[PDB]
């Protein structure tokens, strides 16, 4: 239930802040907020605990604070090895523990690039096989962090969506893929479908219709 930005980026040497927004039951209710750093293919590591304490051995460029229902992690003097996924966590009223949605921190090492989006409707051969997959392929973007939303006509769709985590292309920009799986009846029963990709606070949308080509 703890909301984090999906992506935060900064140039080397600069200071960035990751916000963690919870409720009066979570971040607002206790001083038991933690921050965890996770590099690719490895286990999390504790950065900050009890809102603002640092384990010994953790660089003092990391700092934690809290205000109301929002906790904040601040990384001063960004270094390339600070590039990782960051999760906040808190004790809750429900006598549980919860992690935030997670933030990919990018240390800018190449120019920013807006995503190119190509949306493929289901192929005739797949529909004849009584299946229907919409394929939204997102390419040539940096930083490598996007969020994908799907729409049938104009209302959002959450069932049947699968999205890969971005990885580098041959041209050393990033690419990702998102799928909307539906039945052939579902495919023909709507007027249009849309893949919307949000990147760096801005959204590109592509739309396909069953009656176009």
């Amino acid at each position: 239930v703890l909301t984090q930005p999906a992506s935060v980026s900064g140039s080397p040497g600069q200071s960035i802040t990751i916000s963690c927004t919870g409720t009066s039951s979570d971040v607002g209710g206790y001083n038991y907020v933690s921050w965890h750093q996770q590099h690719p293919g490895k286990a999390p590591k504790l950065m900050i605990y009890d809102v603002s304490n640092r384990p010994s051995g953790v660089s003092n460029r990391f700092s934690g604070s809290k205000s109301g229902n929002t906790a904040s992690l601040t990384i001063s003097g960004l270094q390339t090895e600070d590039e990782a996924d960051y999760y906040c966590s808190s004790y809750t009223s429900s006598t549980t523990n919860v992690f935030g949605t997670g933030t990919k921190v990018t240390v800018l090492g190449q120019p920013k690039a807006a995503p190119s989006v190509t949306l493929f409707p289901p192929s005739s051969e797949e529909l004849q096989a009584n299946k229907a997959t919409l394929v939204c392929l997102i390419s040539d973007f940096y930083p490598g962090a996007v969020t994908v939303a799907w729409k049938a006509d104009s209302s959002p769709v959450k069932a049947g969506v699968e999205t890969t985590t971005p990885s580098k292309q041959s041209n050393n920009k990033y690419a990702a893929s998102s799928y909307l799986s539906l039945t052939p009846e579902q495919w023909k029963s709507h007027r249009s479908y849309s893949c919307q990709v949000t990147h760096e606070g801005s959204t590109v949308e592509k739309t396909v219709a069953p009656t176009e080509c």
Partner: protein, 222 residues
């Protein structure tokens, strides 16, 4: 010196049970609570369960309550997670994590140390070759592709024109569907002027099923 080693993960069929263990060393295991945390492939951390230093208190996430039990055997410095009624939604790397606080029955955190995790993949699927569908050009540069659907297990490797076509090709990581089968896409951008003349074929290899598929990708009828 603190070390945590999870084990017991593997492939399991839905509805079955599985028991994970986490062995601890380098600290007085007897003095600290222990958490289980899982992470689905490419997703975020999800807290699972916690147990106090003497096992007197246990709490679970709503997503596992009733189906998972946490326990410890202090004589063997080992933490256990008993998983029952497994579903595909449970597929994840399972981490054990030590709670920082000394001899207490309040388990508020923080998570102090982590193991390297154990993978539990819940799938009823058996070895199955892939079905390959074309992603034809339609709407200069043009994107073409083929959709490699419903195979098991990994990996599948894809080339284009028997390897002759390399510029602009990207093959994406696989997706794991509800059914427990994998799918992926491979993409290549082409000059639109060549669409009428040049042949494009993606070569799909799935050695676990000893299946090779060559799929011709041609422009759509509009």
């Amino acid at each position: 010196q603190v070390q945590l080693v999870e084990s017991g993960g593997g492939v399991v069929q839905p509805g079955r049970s599985l028991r994970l263990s986490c062995a601890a060393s380098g600290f007085t295991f007897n003095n600290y609570g222990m958490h289980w945390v899982r992470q689905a492939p490419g997703k975020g951390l999800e807290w699972v369960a916690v147990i106090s230093y003497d096992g007197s208190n246990k709490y679970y996430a709503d997503s596992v309550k009733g189906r998972f039990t946490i326990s410890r055997d202090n004589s063997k410095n080992t933490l256990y997670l008993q998983m029952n009624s497994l579903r595909a939604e449970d597929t994840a790397v399972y981490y054990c994590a030590k709670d920082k606080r000394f001899i207490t029955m309040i388990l508020v955190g923080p998570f102090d140390y982590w193991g390297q995790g154990t993978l539990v993949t819940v799938s009823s699927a058996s070895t199955k070759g892939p079905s390959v569908f074309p992603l034809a050009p339609s709407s200069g540069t043009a994107a073409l592709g083929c959709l490699v659907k419903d195979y098991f297990p990994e990996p599948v490797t894809v080339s284009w024109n028997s390897g002759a076509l390399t510029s602009g090709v990207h093959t994406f990581p696989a997706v794991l569907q509800s059914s427990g089968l994998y799918s992926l896409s491979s993409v290549v951008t082409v000059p639109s002027s060549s669409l009428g003349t040049q042949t494009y074929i993606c070569n799909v290899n799935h050695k676990p099923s000893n299946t090779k598929v060559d799929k011709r990708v041609e422009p759509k009828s509009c």
